[PDB]
């Protein structure tokens, strides 16, 4: 959301809560120091599903989308957080989670709705309007039904990143046994 | 905790050092209270402030007031507990100020009451402990309760007034 100081000096960071980071449009990149507290209060609200505005000290506001984040093992808190930029209406493919709305009548049949893959990369066009979620109706499918990637609704001409036939949601059959 | 203290018109409290005493119609009862704590009469009704918000403090706040409160109701209305004997042919008598109890025990068991306390047995199986001090009266009637603790089966023994007891029913 906001940051003030962003030096090369490493030990000024953890004295407060701040994450060593960067941002780039390829036209330029530069030092970053970001408050950790309001960041994971922020990223929590956003992720890669959408961009948020940046205000650096010195009166420079450049809108950016979160790209990749390097997490510390043995802990929760992140140690890195890469950032990328926005050029309308081209910009880089955005990862979209699969939210599975409605209760299937095959889960009523003793099965379990399971999403094989989430955060589909897709792309395009506006990164004002980005697909922060993906709605998929499962009431149709019952048991053994594999919903593929060509069945997923993506308005405004967002081309599928992966294969059309790749399986996203598949409802898994009830637990079965026969022999002793 | 609860700050207000209702003080009757016949009681006197002088708070100096670690000595806080109440004198009234039922006689004097003197219970020592904390010095580090602030206790004094504000107007008519009593007020006990506490020095800090610290954890070890506030612990003696909720303590102190009811201790003084007990002293208030102690020198005013006094205190009494009702005891009940249950089980076959249990009984109690009175010799001097002393309670004579006989319950299911080869050699009968008796109790000499400490001063300030007085026994009353208006009915053969009904025992009343009378007294000022709310502490001593407690251990007095807890001593009487010692003699036979009501069993998990038929509930035979000494109990409090109408206190209800669950039963095991083995056979």
């Amino acid at each position: 959301m906001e940051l003030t100081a962003k030096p090369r000096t490493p030990k000024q960071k953890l004295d407060e809560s701040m994450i060593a980071a960067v941002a780039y449009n390829k036209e330029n990149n530069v030092s970053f120091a970001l408050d950790r507290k309001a960041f994971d209060r922020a990223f929590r609200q956003q992720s890669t599903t959408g961009l948020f505005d940046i205000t650096v000290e010195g009166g420079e506001t450049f809108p950016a989308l979160v790209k990749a984040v390097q997490m510390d093992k043995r802990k929760r808190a992140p140690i890195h957080v890469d950032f990328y930029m926005v050029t309308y209406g081209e910009p880089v493919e955005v990862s979209v989670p699969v939210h599975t709305t409605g209760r299937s009548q095959g889960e009523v049949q003793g099965g379990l709705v399971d999403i094989v893959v989430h955060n589909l990369q897709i792309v395009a066009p506006g990164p004002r309007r980005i697909p922060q979620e993906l709605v998929v109706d499962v009431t149709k499918m019952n048991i053994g039904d594999h919903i593929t990637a060509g069945d997923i609704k993506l308005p405004e001409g967002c081309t599928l990143a992966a294969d059309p036939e790749l399986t996203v949601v598949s409802v898994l059959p009830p637990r079965l046994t026969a022999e002793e | 905790g609860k700050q207000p203290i209702a003080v009757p018109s016949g009681v006197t409290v002088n708070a100096q050092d670690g000595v806080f005493k109440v004198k009234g119609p039922k006689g004097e009862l003197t219970v020592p209270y904390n010095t580090e704590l602030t206790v004094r009469q504000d107007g008519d009704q009593l007020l006990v402030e506490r020095p800090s918000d610290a954890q070890k403090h506030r612990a003696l706040h909720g303590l102190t007031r009811t201790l003084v409160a007990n002293a208030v109701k102690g020198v005013s209305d006094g205190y009494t507990i009702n005891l009940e004997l249950r089980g076959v042919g249990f009984r109690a008598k009175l010799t001097g100020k002393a309670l004579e109890m006989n319950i299911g025990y080869s050699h009968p068991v008796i109790i000499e009451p400490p001063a300030g306390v007085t026994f009353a047995v208006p009915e053969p199986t009904r025992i009343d402990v009378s007294g000022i001090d709310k502490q001593l009266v407690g251990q007095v009637a807890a001593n009487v309760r010692k003699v036979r603790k009501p069993d998990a089966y038929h509930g035979k023994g000494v109990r409090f007034v109408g206190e209800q007891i669950a039963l095991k029913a083995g056979k």
């Binding site: 929590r44 992720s47 890669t48 399971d114 637990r175 | -």
Partner: protein, 136 residues
Amino acid sequence: KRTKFRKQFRGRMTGDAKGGDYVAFGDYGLIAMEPAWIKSNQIEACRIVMSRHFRRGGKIYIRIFPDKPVTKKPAETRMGKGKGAVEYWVSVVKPGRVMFEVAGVTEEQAKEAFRLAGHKLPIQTKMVKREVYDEA
């Protein structure tokens, strides 16, 4: 559990968890805090433990798995060679590595089903949720 044909032997060393993620294959997952070996059993009992507390449902995922063979005294002493081919199989796990993951069960549902499997495990553990999303 114990696997098919191999190289057959090993020594030992310890770093930090490399290929364990934070999350995968479900909502909730289990993460080891201490460097250690886990055997063919343990995790085998951990599966059975977790599944027992479920509907038996096939929603459980085990990212861990025994590879490393360990050995033992045939009877005693130092007489002779190194020996003990089948004693047990172990799977080394390092801190931050995610061990098990579950699917479709609720919050307390998998909280208690991890807790039961918390015991039977030589190390302390903590379960989790997803923030970092990494698939590539």
